[PDB]
Amino acid sequence: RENLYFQGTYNISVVGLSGTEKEKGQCGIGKSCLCNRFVRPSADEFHLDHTSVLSTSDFGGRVVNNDHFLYWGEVSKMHIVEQTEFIDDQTFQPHRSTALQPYIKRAAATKLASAEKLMYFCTDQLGLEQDFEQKQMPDGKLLVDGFLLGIDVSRNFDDQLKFVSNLYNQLAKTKKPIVVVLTKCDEGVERYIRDAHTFALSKKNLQVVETSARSNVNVDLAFSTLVQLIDK
Ligand SMILES: Nc1nc2c(ncn2[C@@H]2O[C@H](COP(=O)(O)OP(=O)(O)NP(=O)(O)O)[C@@H](O)[C@H]2O)c(=O)[nH]1
Ligand SMILES: [Mg+2]
Ligand SMILES: [Mg+2]
Numbered sequence: 001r002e003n004l005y006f007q008g009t010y011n012i013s014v015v016g017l018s019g020t021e022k023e024k025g026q027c028g029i030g031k032s033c034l035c036n037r038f039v040r041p042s043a044d045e046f047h048l049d050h051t052s053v054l055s056t057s058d059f060g061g062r063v064v065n066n067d068h069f070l071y072w073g074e075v076s077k078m079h080i081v082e083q084t085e086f087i088d089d090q091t092f093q094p095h096r097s098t099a100l101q102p103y104i105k106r107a108a109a110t111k112l113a114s115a116e117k118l119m120y121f122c123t124d125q126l127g128l129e130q131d132f133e134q135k136q137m138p139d140g141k142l143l144v145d146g147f148l149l150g151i152d153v154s155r156n157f158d159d160q161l162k163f164v165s166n167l168y169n170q171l172a173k174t175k176k177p178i179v180v181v182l183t184k185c186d187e188g189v190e191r192y193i194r195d196a197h198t199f200a201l202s203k204k205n206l207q208v209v210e211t212s213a214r215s216n217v218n219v220d221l222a223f224s225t226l227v228q229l230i231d232k
Pocket of ligand 2: 028031032033050052082084
């Protein structure tokens, strides 16, 4: 409720350039690794490799649950979702392509009902979910409180930033708090970092947190920064 000092639970959606392997140059922008390091930061539980190329069976399992988002779990309360795009492992087109909103619209969704969705660990889990802990997304539904807007600044960047700008506009229409997160800063390019900062400075009170999921720098800070903004 709006009158409370701390709302106590925070549903955070992590978004950024997403699509086919080709649209990502066979290299995603860092959403999954950011989420993974936040929710389960131990070396034993952190995976650098989280493919979004899935079989129809993987896509229809209870972890993916016919969604283009993943429930990464609960941090203790913060519930973490990654908005992405899953492609078929034979046709290489998005799962349910004809039925889908474009990513920018999909990713800006603030009501995320996926009943009996299980928490995601890794693509190994998929269709083998009995082999992992089975934690369900709360209430089968999340009302998004805020967004982390990811930008890969590591060494086609200008097209990424164009996409980020269009995605930002969709997010801003929600009137939900947004924090820009620069990802893979352990390999960061100063020109890219500078351009990302210029973009965020063009907006009203848009903070930028510089992160590395790989080196485990500023991951908690990115999320805490958003939680603080949510409660303002
Ligand atoms: N150097 C470096 N590489 C990283 C970092 N985070 C992720 N990566 C690399 O970038 C790859 C893609 O990261 P990933 O988190 O899966 O991206 P994504 O945005 O989830 N991709 P998708 O759009 O497919 O869901 C990883 O497999 C890893 O090689 C980081 O902090 N530093
Ligand atoms: Mg991912
Ligand atoms: Mg409040």
